[PDB]
Design a protein around this ligand. Structure first.
Ligand SMILES: CC1=C(CC/C(C)=C/CC/C(C)=C/CCC2=CC(=O)O[C@@H]2O)C(C)(C)CCC1
Lengths: 10, 234
């Protein structure tokens, strides 16, 4: 649930 | 053996997330290519949007690195926020054209020095340019630039790392892979591997001046940092 985290889980 | 595969796996993560200078349709503009202003807003506009894409590409690059995705998410963020500016400076400096004194972005955008200054490098402009010139003698290819980035990235000594010990384990084959790779390509010259390592220090010296530019910049821009770029410094 943060740009970075979305980027990292997708 | 297993070394070769690491080199090639790191070379690919770099090739795929970062096209070579010559794969690119170049194209300039004449915006403040003459006089050094404090900031040109149209330059800043293209540049900032480009940078959101770089940072995405740099995350993509990281995810393809052996073992990186096994680290906790929190570690992965910690390492990234820490090295990402450095990587983007290296990356862009790998796109320098000495003749034109220019740098080319991944979409083709090709800015001379004054323009780079005016899109927000400001004080850092000259240091970036010097670093880019000091790279040329090194003659680095994709595997070296990729490895060097992986090494800056996978650093055991970051503050707040939850598994420093595991990060260190990851970084060891990278160092080695680079050592042997550089020796292969340049047997004549033995302190080329260290010469390369030490380039991370110049990256640091420049990226460290980062936050203070972020401040004096936040001032002369209209809105505010694009969200993702906010996430990486702030
Ligand atoms: C220190 C600081 C910075 C960051 C400067 C920055 C992000 C430099 C890297 C630029 C870049 C993109 C390098 C290669 C990667 C790409 C090339 C390309 O064509 O698109 C790709 O993103 C500002 C902008 C000066 C203010 C904000 C804090």
């Amino acid at each position: 649930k943060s740009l970075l985290q979305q980027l990292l889980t997708e | 053996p297993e070394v070769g595969e690491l080199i090639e796996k790191v070379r690919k993560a770099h090739q795929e997330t970062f096209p070579a200078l010559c794969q690119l349709g170049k194209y300039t503009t004449n915006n403040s290519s003459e006089q050094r202003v404090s900031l040109d807003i149209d330059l800043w506009d293209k540049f900032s949007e480009l940078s959101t894409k770089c940072i995405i590409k740099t995350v993509e690059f990281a995810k393809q690195l052996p073992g990186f995705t096994t680290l906790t998410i929190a570690d992965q963020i910690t390492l990234l926020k820490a090295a990402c500016l450095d990587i983007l400076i290296l990356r862009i400096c790998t796109r320098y054209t000495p003749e034109q004194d220019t740098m080319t972005f991944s979409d083709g955008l090709t800015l001379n020095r004054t323009q780079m200054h005016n899109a927000g490098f400001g004080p850092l402009t000259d240091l970036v340019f010097a670093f880019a010139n000091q790279l040329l003698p090194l003659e680095m290819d994709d595997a070296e630039t990729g490895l060097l980035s992986a090494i800056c990235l996978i650093c055991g000594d970051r503050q707040d790392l939850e598994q420093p010990d595991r990060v260190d384990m990851l970084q060891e084959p990278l160092l080695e892979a680079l050592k042997v790779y550089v020796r292969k390509r340049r047997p004549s010259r033995p302190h080329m591997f260290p010469k390369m390592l030490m380039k991370i220090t110049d990256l640091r010296s420049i990226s460290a001046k980062g936050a203070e530019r972020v401040i004096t910049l936040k001032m002369e821009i209209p809105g505010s940092m694009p969200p993702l770029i906010q996430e990486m410094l702030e």
